């Protein structure tokens, strides 16, 4: 089975700057008929993959001139001359010369923008949820950059690791930002047992936490 690797795994790059993605095969992918069926695919968030390049260096129809392909034997490259926001997503190489045909594992292209701080909201549970014996507390951290962030829950001043679920968006091409959700799920009995609920968020846009909080009253 032929085998493809890509580097880097993710690639941070500014608008208008340039980018290069490498693809290596574990053996030669020249077909007996003489051609090299190496193709590059781009999958934008929430969409099907699209063809960019075929037979190593041929731009498919409609694809911008900013994309170019090169390589030979077992090493290939996708170059992007000038990065637009729409070009954000996952890039996959693929070889179609040798059964079973295979894809590389993907390379995330990340648009580097000016740093941004999260906008923190915190939400007590609904009365509808309490009535049925549950109590979820939700924290939104919206529209921040870069993607690395630490979040922690404190209940009456002490930390809580247990029963905390976290979820990140992919990067938005509108702005070039990330959001994340953090949820703390408890029983109504465990929730009524305390008063002060707090998420504190740490991010390189500040030396000190951003804290939202509420009192069960």
């Amino acid at each position: 089975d032929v085998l493809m690797t890509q580097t880097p795994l993710s690639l941070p790059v500014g608008l208008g700057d340039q980018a290069s993605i490498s693809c290596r095969s574990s053996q030669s992918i020249v077909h007996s008929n003489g051609n090299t069926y190496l193709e590059w695919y781009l999958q934008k968030p929430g969409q099907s993959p699209k063809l960019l390049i075929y037979k190593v260096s041929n731009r498919f129809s409609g694809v911008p001139d900013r994309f170019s392909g090169s390589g030979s034997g077992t090493d290939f490259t996708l170059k992007i001359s000038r990065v637009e926001a729409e070009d954000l997503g996952v890039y996959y190489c693929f070889q179609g010369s040798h059964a079973p045909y295979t894809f590389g594992g993907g390379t995330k292209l990340e648009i580097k923008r000016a740093d941004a701080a999260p906008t923190v909201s915190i939400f007590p549970p609904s009365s509808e949820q309490l009535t049925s014996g549950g109590a979820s507390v939700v924290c939104f951290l919206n529209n921040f950059y870069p993607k690395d962030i630490n979040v922690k829950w404190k209940i009456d001043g002490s930390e809580r690791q247990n029963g905390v679920l976290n979820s990140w968006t992919d990067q938005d091409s509108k702005d070039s930002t990330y959001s994340m959700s953090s949820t703390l799920t408890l029983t109504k009995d465990e929730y009524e047992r305390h008063n002060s609920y707090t998420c504190e968020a740490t991010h390189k846009t500040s030396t000190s936490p951003i804290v939202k909080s509420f009192n069960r009253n």
Partner: protein, 211 residues
């Protein structure tokens, strides 16, 4: 060139499922078609390819004996018959058309297959309520399998909206959605999150009211 896949859904390990792909916009019998899948870790894997006339069929070895592929050229349709499904087969399945020089030239929207023993379960939907802007959400809790669909005010509100990816915990998915609107228009004007889950035929419209 339009390609539209269907027939995806939840099935127990060992079970069977049939997928369809309907094509239009071209002489269907002239082009080879392919099935390609994407796992939840987002790896892509080729599954099979079938020639225009349907005589030549090439496929992955791990699906030999279990998956069957055929096409009706009269009805402009391609089929994948799955049996002996395993949890590794869980994936978005994509049909796709070949073209001189390239392999997967036109792709469909895909159809999600979930292989598992968890029971189907409809979501519970709960309002999240709490400066010139204000942020609201709804929590869609305890549903299975994926996907759900979330719009705000029946689609009349795309401007400042995002949905976080769902998270699995103990055989049930949980997801949330935030909207941001001007303070002066809420509560005064209403905000309503609309959730649909086709796998249970559930639709819930949940109005965000202030506490």
């Amino acid at each position: 060139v339009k390609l539209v896949e269907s027939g995806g859904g939840l099935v127990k390990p060992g079970g069977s499922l049939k997928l369809s792909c309907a094509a239009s916009g071209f002489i269907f019998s002239n082009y080879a078609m392919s099935w390609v899948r994407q796992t939840p870790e987002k790896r892509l894997e080729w599954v099979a390819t079938i020639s225009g006339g349907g005589r030549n069929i090439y496929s992955l070895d791990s699906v030999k004996g279990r998956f069957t592929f055929f096409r009706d050229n009269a009805r402009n349709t391609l089929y994948l018959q799955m049996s002996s499904l395993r949890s590794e087969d869980t994936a978005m399945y994509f049909c796709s058309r070949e073209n001189y020089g390239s392999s997967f030239t036109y792709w469909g929207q895909g159809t999600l297959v979930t292989v598992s023993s968890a029971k189907t379960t409809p979501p519970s939907v709960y309002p999240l309520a709490p400066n010139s802007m204000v942020t609201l959400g709804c929590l869609v809790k305890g549903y299975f399998p994926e996907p759900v669909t979330v719009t705000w005010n029946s689609g009349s509100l795309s401007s400042g909206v995002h949905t976080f990816p769902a998270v699995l915990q103990s055989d049930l998915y949980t997801l949330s959605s935030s909207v941001t609107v001007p303070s002066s228009t809420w509560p005064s004007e209403t905000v309503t999150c609309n959730v649909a889950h086709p796998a249970s035929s559930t639709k819930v419209d949940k109005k965000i009211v202030p506490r």
